[PDB]
UniProtKB/Swiss-Prot annotation:
Full-protein positions shown: 71 to 361 of 361
Gene Ontology molecular function, alphabetical: cytochrome-c peroxidase activity; heme binding; metal ion binding; peroxidase activity
Catalytic residue positions: H51, W190
Stated name of the protein: Cytochrome c peroxidase, mitochondrial
Superkingdom, taxonomy of origin: Eukaryota
Gene: CCP1
Binding site for heme b: H174
Summary of the function given for this chain in its UniProt record: Destroys radicals which are normally produced within the cells and which are toxic to biological systems.
Length: 293
């Protein structure tokens, strides 16, 4: 039923070459700090890594991070991907300096570098995604809608082979960045610390006083008097009793949430890829701070 995508290391490259790419991304994150009203590019890079991987379908191995297909117009213009052009334009000069890295390796490594540089967990990362042609680009409509309930979320993520814990852990990336009305029809940040990776999304779900309101695009979202919001699908994590347990867990254990996020995010970025037996081990890149850079 299933196409095989075998990881193929970019020729002669090793951990040091990819740490250089990581560094170039991390230094540009630091440099281009004004983006999106001084949020910086971290959040949108995490989202680009996710949306370029989250097209995967476990049933037939279509979509997924391997082929780097977001570079093709059908996927770049998915209405679900509105806004990610900013992440892509950010990665352009990185790809020009390191033209030997594949597009899938760069889009996934952009997400890993962003989470780490924003003081999140270390995320092991494996190289070897290989660009595939335009006709392998998955159709629009594989990424999730925001107006739905917990049952939708649970069913949706079964296609990406994620269970409840992985779903709840991945959603904590909504600590980061904001919704922008012109992109998605929702507006506002989920919390205060939105370029530093913490478990604030679960603390705010449980602790803020949320009101169900309509925003200026006439879509419902949950809002707090702190100026934060939650999408219907975020709020569903405290409406469903199974998800709520795991929300309370991560609101109360930052290390657990980091460890679970790191595994789920690595899995998301690797779904669909076959690693040969003698492939290199996953790399754990040092942050700029760890290197004194
Ligand atoms: C039910 C699943 C999800 C839904 C419906 C959803 C929906 C959305 C929406 C509507 C936005 C705002 C886009 C904009 O207006 O710019 C957004 C932003 C964001 N999403 Fe999600 N999301 C989901 C899951 C995830 C996951 C799994 C991750 C990564 C692990 C993620 C990471 C992010 C990040 C980092 C942003 C902020 C982007 C920025 O600030 O530019 N999301 N999401």
């Amino acid at each position: 039923k299933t196409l095989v995508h075998v990881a193929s290391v970019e020729k002669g490259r090793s951990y040091e070459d990819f740490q250089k790419v990581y560094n170039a991304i991390a230094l540009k994150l630091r440099e281009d700090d004004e983006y999106d009203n001084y949020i910086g590019y971290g959040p949108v890079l995490v989202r680009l890594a996710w949306h370029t991987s989250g097209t995967w379908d476990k049933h037939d191995n279509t979509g997924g991070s391997y082929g780097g297909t977001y570079r093709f117009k059908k996927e770049f213009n998915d209405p679900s991907n509105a806004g990610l052009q900013n992440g892509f334009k950010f990665l352009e000069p990185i790809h020009k300096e390191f033209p030997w890295i594949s597009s899938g390796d760069l889009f996934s490594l952009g997400g890993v570098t962003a989470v780490q540089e924003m003081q999140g967990p270390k995320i092991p990362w494996r190289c070897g995604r290989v660009d595939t042609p335009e006709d392998t680009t998955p159709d629009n409509g594989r990424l999730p809608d925001a107006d739905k309930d917990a049952d939708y979320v649970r069913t949706f993520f079964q296609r990406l082979n994620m269970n409840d814990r992985e779903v709840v852990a991945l959603m904590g990336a909504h600590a980061l960045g904001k919704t922008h009305l012109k992109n998605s029809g929702y507006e506002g940040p989920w919390g205060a610390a939105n370029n530093v990776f913490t478990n604030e999304f679960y603390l705010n779900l449980l602790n803020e006083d949320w009101k169900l309101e309509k925003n200026d695009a006439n879509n419902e979202q949950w809002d707090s008097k702190s100026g934060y919001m939650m999408l219907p699908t975020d709020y569903s994590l405290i409406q469903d009793p199974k998800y709520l347990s795991i929300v309370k867990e991560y609101a109360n254990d930052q290390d657990k949430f980091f460890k679970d996020f790191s595994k789920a995010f690595e899995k998301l970025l690797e779904n669909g890829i076959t690693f040969p037996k003698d492939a290199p081990s996953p790399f754990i890149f040092k942050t700029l701070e760890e290197q004194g850079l």
